[PDB]
């Protein structure tokens, strides 16, 4: 392609590809894959996109955009980066530049989602108006497409609608103006919005890539915080005090809406596994919930740095 659009601030590269298709009058998706990439064997994905580097070659004459900038500021990788580890993170960064599509999804154990978790398209009530007033266009923002939280960090809640990624595969779809939120209010829980607002600062941080604790330090961090908070007696979990501490911030219905329902009656649980020695990388939601429930006077960057340093 000759005139490739430059992505806006906080925009998925998928929406940039879709707007490139919109600008130059390409309707058939096969032509779009022929011109953007050169091959008709590329799967369209939201978050952790593959075949990057080709999208950067069209932006070669703009020296500021490279593989690293696109992979830290226009994808959903920084959310998965600090928690998976160091070697796995670096290998994923080095692999998303090549032609591997399913390898990116399958290498990270945390990212091995298998079946999609409600992969339909979402937007916001007031973000679209702000984008139209500031840009004159609409795009799939990175804030909207949280892996499991259908909640804008600034607004109440998202608004799902029809169509899904698994239904039609090779199509890059971008919202224009012909569809928008019809006037009806959507109920929103304050705790979930607070959690989303707390966790959203992770996608824009200069040190969000270096602050990656190793596999062994996580259990030491958990034991140190439990010792300083004095919950453990002697290498033991109360099974009720930690449950009450979590319940003081998050209720049962909010956790059910997040599929992270507490199972305090049964020995196996995500919190219990966090207490035990870790095996594989855990999702951002579990770590954020544990950190916020067990310490409410700190933010993501300082807590992650404290965990990594010692």
């Amino acid at each position: 392609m000759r005139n490739f659009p430059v992505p806006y601030s906080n925009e998925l590269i998928y929406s940039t590809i879709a707007r490139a298709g919109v600008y130059q009058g390409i309707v058939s998706p096969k032509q779009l894959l022929d011109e953007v990439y050169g091959n008709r064997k590329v799967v369209a994905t939201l978050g952790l996109p593959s075949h990057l580097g080709v999208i950067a070659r069209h932006l070669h004459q703009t020296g500021r955009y490279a593989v690293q900038q696109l992979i830290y500021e226009h994808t959903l990788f920084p959310l998965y980066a600090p928690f998976v580890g160091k070697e796995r993170r670096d290998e994923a960064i080095r692999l998303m530049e090549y032609q591997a599509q399913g390898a990116v999804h399958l290498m990270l154990g945390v990212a091995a989602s298998r079946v999609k978790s409600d992969n339909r398209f979402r937007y916001c009530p007031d973000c679209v108006a702000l984008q139209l007033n500031r840009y004159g266009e609409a795009f799939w923002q990175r804030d909207w497409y949280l892996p499991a939280l259908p909640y804008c960090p600034k607004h109440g809640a998202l608004v799902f609608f029809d169509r899904a990624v698994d239904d039609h595969r090779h199509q890059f779809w971008a919202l224009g103006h012909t569809e928008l939120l019809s006037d009806y209010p959507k109920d929103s829980l304050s705790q979930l919005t607070a959690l989303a607002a707390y966790i959203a600062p992770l996608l824009d941080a200069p040190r969000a890539q270096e602050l990656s604790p190793s596999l062994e330090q996580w259990t030491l961090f958990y034991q140190r915080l439990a010792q300083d908070l004095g919950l453990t007696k002697s290498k033991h979990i109360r099974h009720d005090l930690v449950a009450e501490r979590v319940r003081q911030t998050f209720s049962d219905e909010a956790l059910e809406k997040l599929d992270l329902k507490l199972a305090e009656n049964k020995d196996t649980c995500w919190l219990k596994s966090i207490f035990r020695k870790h095996r594989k990388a855990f999702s951002y939601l579990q770590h954020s919930i544990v950190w916020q429930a067990l310490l409410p006077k700190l933010t993501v960057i300082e807590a992650l740095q404290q965990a990594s340093a010692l």
Binding site: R2, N3, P5, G25, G136, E137, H177
Partner: protein, 391 residues
């Protein structure tokens, strides 16, 4: 195909304050010195006059290709082109988000198929149109090409990724079919750019509305500034019902899409048909005196001689003979002068004269004697006869 990284300027008009497109253009020259800017002539030098025969004969034939002289209408055309290409960027600002509304609309036109669809109400288009028709043998294909040589055509911006083409020139097909303008446009928009738009948009089995809206959208993906079409006379030879379709599409594009369009055609193209500008061949007498423009043209064409002998001053008899043999048309003056020089060098007389001019015309313009004699006679019936005669 001169790819330049643009460096921005700061114009004095508040309507043009923050565009990158129209800041990138070179400034509008003052008409006092714009006439001197257009002036070009052969470098001559006196070392040729003492050289061999065929070498000297070769460089005389470069006079019709290297000689240009500005006139009164040249400044008006330059000012009008500058105004019409500066008025076509005030509605497609990409910095403040106005091109992204002129370009989102262009996709629902392709999807639906109709050119009159509109998704954003505030997407306004500011563009102009102008037709330039003058008697054949006036220069309206090289004068335009020399006016549009200041602008470097393709210019590349840095903050954006747009490779803005300043102007584009295409020719109507002799057939006049609907699927030929939308093809030589895609040929002219990848000859000067290095891409392949034709292999995308023309090879496939497409319709006519699809390939009429695709052109109007790809002419806004790049911020095209002026689409000029020459030889518009060809549409009258097209199939039945196809002459008016272009006459509506080239007024819808100016109004809706917003790309300014300039159409140039021969005098025969008044009946088939925005502003109107008419050109006429030069006439030496305005009211009762030989005109300064004609006198200067001849006195400056004089010095482009490589005859071993000559005379200091031109004579009124020779001037009258030249005017009578030319009948005012621009090209025939230069053609007659170069042919007379060629015949003088061939004959062996190193001097030019009126009888020499007459014999050169008579022996070397045999296809041209009928209509030149018609012009010399000046009968209104003979002028109305044939086509594209001055009237």
């Amino acid at each position: 195909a001169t790819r330049i990284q643009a460096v921005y300027r700061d114009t004095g008009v508040e309507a043009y304050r923050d565009n990158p497109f129209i800041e990138a253009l070179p400034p509008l020259q003052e008409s006092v010195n714009s006439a001197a800017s257009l002036k070009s002539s052969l470098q001559l030098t006196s070392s040729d006059l003492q050289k061999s025969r065929v070498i000297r004969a070769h460089t005389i034939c470069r006079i019709p290709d290297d000689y240009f002289q500005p006139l009164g209408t040249h400044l008006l055309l330059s000012e009008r082109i500058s105004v019409m290409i500066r008025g076509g960027y005030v509605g497609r600002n990409p910095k403040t988000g106005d091109l992204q509304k002129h370009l989102q609309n262009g996709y629902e036109r392709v999807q639906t198929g109709e050119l009159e669809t509109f998704r954003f109400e505030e997407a306004r288009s500011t563009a102009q149109s102008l037709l330039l028709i003058g008697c054949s043998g006036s220069g309206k294909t090289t004068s335009l090409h020399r006016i549009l040589a200041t602008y470097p055509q393709v210019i590349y911006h840095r903050e954006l990724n747009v490779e803005q083409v300043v102007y584009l020139k295409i020719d109507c097909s002799h057939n006049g079919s609907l699927k030929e303008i939308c093809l030589n446009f895609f040929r002219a928009l990848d000859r000067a750019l290095g891409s392949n738009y034709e292999r995308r948009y023309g090879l496939k089995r497409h319709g006519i509305e699809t390939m009429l809206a695709l052109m109007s959208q790809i002419a806004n993906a790049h911020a095209l500034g002026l689409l000029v079409i020459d030889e518009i006379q060809h549409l009258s030879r097209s199939r039945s019902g196809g002459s008016q379709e272009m006459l509506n599409f080239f007024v819808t594009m100016v109004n809706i899409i917003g790309v300014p369009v300039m159409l140039i055609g021969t005098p025969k193209a008044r009946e088939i048909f925005f502003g109107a500008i008419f050109w006429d061949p030069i006439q030496q007498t305005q009211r009762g005196k030989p005109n300064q423009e004609w006198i200067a043209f001849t006195d400056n064409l004089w010095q482009l001689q490589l005859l071993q002998r000559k005379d200091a001053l031109l004579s009124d008899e020779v001037r009258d003979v030249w005017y009578e043999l030319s009948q005012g048309v621009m090209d025939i003056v230069v053609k007659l002068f170069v042919l007379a020089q060629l015949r003088a060098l061939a004959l062996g007389n190193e001097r030019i004269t009126a009888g020499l001019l007459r014999q050169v015309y008579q022996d070397e313009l045999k296809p041209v004697h009928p209509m030149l004699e018609a012009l010399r006679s000046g009968i209104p019936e003979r002028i109305a006869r044939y086509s594209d005669l001055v009237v």
